Amino acid sequence: FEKFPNRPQMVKISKLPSDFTVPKIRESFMKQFIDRVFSIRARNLLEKETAVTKILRACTRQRMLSMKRKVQEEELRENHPYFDKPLFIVGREHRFRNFCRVVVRARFH
């Protein structure tokens, strides 16, 4: 795969007028993005303390809620268009692929 040239997938939306020039942005970034004159009052110590306390509470909430090969694999997956997609037609995110995976990997003093 490393020998072949790079050509990352890019965002494309078909149902737009032909005059719209779609902006150039990576598809993976978009997918992960969608998956998820008077200032006297501000400089008063009380509001500053309140903001710091808010930050501390956020950190406490985060606390309460709580290699190269894998990176290269992901880099190759993003790099090339046909990676991990068997036979170039099965589809890496197809329902039939999920069915095959679940049926094949089904396992059970």
Partner: protein, 731 residues
């Protein structure tokens, strides 16, 4: 380095000899230390300074302990730390180096001194520890075989490791024993959790001892053994990390409030200086390690830092109450700014050590938030602002993978809040604009998208649309490095785009075209809601900017740009309307959530489209006269808006809030009258709106049950809009 050993003391063969060098001769060292700076030259050319330096260098290389004995032992019996540390600093800054053995002996002696002082309580103990820590970070500058694992293991074995490193975890005392003002009185034993202020303990002791409220301010808790007067808002576990069988013994002492406040100020100042010393010590320790082992050291540091229970609080929290004090507040603030700057430096140094593809989760915030904690505390200080900007730029450039996907959602909120909150300060705005321009250079469009996402929740105690427009306008051009923020960044000065894939300048119009696409991608999503809100807040500012540009210069070419921009915006909005077809579909706390989520995107679309048309339409005729009217919105877009309004009416009678919708009323009574209904193609949109209005009123009239709770003033405004449309065009 051959010159760094006692040559003649190493060649001799090794097959006892006792040295008699009384302590009264070692005192002669200090005069020689002073003489190192004496430039007088004898008639034969020998200088006093050269001879003194040679003699003391030879003495240090031969036997460090013998020369540095009369000082280390003497300090124990007297409180002369300042003088000895001054003398040692002069020694360092006059010899210009410390051979491995000399620095080794000095570091071990100083660490042992700290261990002894913590070990055996004494009147001047804490002051001595602070003074020693204030200088230890220089002694550590020249040490060869100091590794994190060995130091941690040995110092933990000593078990008094919480006074040297900051990445030290020690469960604190569970219970505390305190005596009252009198003698032999029944003491009290009280529990201790991990988040207990001394205020609660003081209140409980005060109430339990039957003390009048009038003299409440006259009683303070203090440790007689270590002679410590305690601050109200310091955690119990922090001051007594030792989890021994013996609980610390406190006393409730009475004294004048002023003297108590002064003593508290002094002690907190000394403790903060000690903490700064510890941070400096760690900085020096981690700034001299073979590059091969640096990655392992930084990974270990990150692990211990993450596993520490209350690190973000430790590094962010400050004793705000004492700053207001006029007598001593200024000094405490001036020392805290330095502490925060050193913390930022520590995190940035740690970040660079780690690899560029580290797998990060949400815990990244725990570190990044620290920067925010500093920036909020005092962003008007140039020394901290430039340092923070440089460190953030370094982190962004060093974390290509993370910051290109979801990495700016943690930093930009506080930066935008401060940017909006300090308009009066030109320096802060210019620095933040430079930082934002640098981020835009670094990451191109993804940075802009993440900026929009971060600012959407704060759009109006929030960032106004004008501030966002000003920031984008500043991004539109180049900004000079007024504080030379680029001095501290560690990368090539050209600062070319991080990704090879992306030489263009950010433009507002482009950004709008970029935004609409997001809504097209996932129209029925919260992020689409945020983008719609951003567009609603932004577009009117762009229109006002175009009007101001026209006002500034009357030449025709300005008009040509105005028509070009208007056409581009019209195309973008037409694409948005075409691609948001999904929203056409119609239809206790969960019910409220569904109600609001249904409401927001359609109202935002109506508001944006109606404002755009209302502002532009009239402007077209005047501008053309000043200079073939092009249809701003196609018939299909008009139908899309009409169907969307129909969907809103479908739910309008059931919910009062939908009936009172500002966007819906604006569309009905301020957008229908302006469009030219003369074309039969556009008429069905109006026919559809009329059909729904007729059906709605028939439904209202059918059963009085709905009539009981229905609000009619919105209906009155609705009928007013309908008859206004009828009046404007009789056809």
């Amino acid at each position: 380095l051959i010159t760094a050993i006692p040559i003649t003391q190493e060649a001799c063969y090794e097959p006892p000899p006792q040295a008699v060098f009384p302590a009264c001769i070692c005192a002669a060292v200090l005069p020689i230390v002073h003489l190192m700076e004496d430039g007088e030259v004898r008639e034969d050319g020998v200088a006093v300074s050269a001879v003194a330096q040679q003699v003391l260098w030879n003495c240090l290389i031969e036997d460090p302990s013998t020369v540095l004995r009369h000082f280390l032992e003497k300090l124990t019996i007297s409180n002369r730390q300042d003088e000895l540390m001054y003398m040692l600093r002069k020694l360092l800054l006059n010899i210009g180096d410390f051979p491995a053995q000399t620095s080794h002996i000095l570091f071990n002696y100083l660490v042992g001194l700290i261990m002894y002082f913590v070990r055996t309580p004494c009147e001047w103990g804490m002051d001595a520890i602070s003074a020693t820590l204030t200088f230890l970070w220089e002694v550590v500058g020249y040490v060869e075989g100091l590794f994190f694992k060995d130091l941690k293991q040995t110092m933990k074995k000593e078990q008094c490791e919480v006074k040297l490193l900051v990445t030290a975890s020690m469960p604190g005392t569970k219970t505390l024993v305190v005596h009252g003002q009198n003698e032999c009185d029944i003491p009290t034993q009280l529990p201790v959790h991990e988040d207990t202020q001394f205020e609660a303990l003081l209140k409980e002791c005060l109430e339990f001892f039957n003390i009048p409220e009038s003299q409440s301010t006259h009683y303070f808790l203090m440790d007689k053994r270590w002679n410590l007067i305690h601050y109200n808002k310091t955690y119990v576990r922090d001051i007594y990390p030792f989890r021994r069988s013996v609980s610390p013994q406190l006393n409730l002492v009475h004294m004048h409030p002023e003297k108590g406040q002064e003593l508290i100020q002094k002690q907190v100042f000394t403790r903060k200086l000690e903490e700064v010393g510890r941070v400096l010590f760690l900085i020096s320790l981690t700034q001299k390690i073979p590059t091969a082992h640096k990655q392992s050291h930084v990974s270990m540091l990150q692990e211990d830092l993450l596993r520490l229970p209350s690190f973000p609080r430790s590094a962010i929290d400050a004793e705000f109450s004492l700053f207001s004090d006029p007598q001593a507040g200024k000094e405490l603030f001036g020392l805290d700014t330095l502490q925060k700057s050193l913390w930022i430096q520590l995190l940035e140094e740690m970040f660079l050590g780690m690899p560029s593809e580290f797998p990060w989760g949400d815990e990244i915030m725990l570190f990044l938030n620290v920067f925010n904690g500093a920036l909020i505390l005092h962003p008007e200080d140039s020394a901290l602002l430039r340092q923070y900007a440089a460190t953030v730029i370094n982190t962004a450039v060093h974390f290509n993978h993370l910051f290109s996907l979801s990495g700016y959602q943690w930093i930009l909120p506080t930066m935008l809040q401060v940017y909006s909150d300090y308009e009066s300060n030109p320096q802060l705005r210019q620095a933040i604009e430079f930082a934002c321009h640098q981020f835009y250079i670094l990451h191109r469009k993804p940075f802009v998208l993440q900026l929009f996402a971060s600012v959407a929740p704060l759009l109006e105690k929030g960032v106004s649309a004008q501030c966002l427009f000003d920031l984008l306008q500043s991004l539109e051009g180049e900004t000079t490095d007024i504080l030379d923020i680029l001095e501290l960044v560690k990368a090539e000065k050209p600062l070319k785009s991080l990704d090879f894939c992306y030489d263009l300048t950010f433009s507002i119009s482009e950004a709008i075209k970029l935004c609409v696409t997001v809504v097209a991608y996932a129209p029925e999503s919260f992020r689409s809601l945020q983008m719609l809100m951003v567009l609603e807040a932004l577009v009117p500012c762009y229109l006002q900017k175009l009007k101001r540009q026209t006002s500034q210069v009357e030449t025709v070419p300005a008009a040509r740009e105005e028509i070009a921009a208007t056409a581009a915006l019209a195309t973008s909005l037409q694409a948005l309307l075409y691609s948001v077809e999904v929203l056409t579909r119609p239809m206790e706390l969960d019910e409220r959530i569904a109600r609001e989520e249904f409401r927001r995107p359609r109202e935002s679309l109506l508001n944006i489209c109606t404002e755009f048309y209302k502002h532009c339409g009239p402007r077209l005729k005047i501008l053309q006269n000043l200079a073939i009217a092009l249809e701003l919105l196609d018939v299909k877009s008009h139908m899309r808006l009409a169907e969307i309004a129909h969907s809103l009416l479908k739910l309008a009678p059931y919910d009062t809030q939908t009936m009172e919708s500002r966007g819906l009323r604006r569309y009905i009574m301020e957008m229908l009258p302006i469009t030219d209904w003369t074309a039969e193609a556009v008429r069905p949109a109006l026919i559809l709106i009329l059909k729904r209005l007729d059906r709605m009123f028939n439904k209202i009239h059918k059963m009085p049950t709905l009539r009981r709770q229905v609000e009619w003033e919105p209906a009155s405004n609705l009928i007013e809009g309908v008859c206004l449309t009828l009046q404007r065009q009789p056809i």
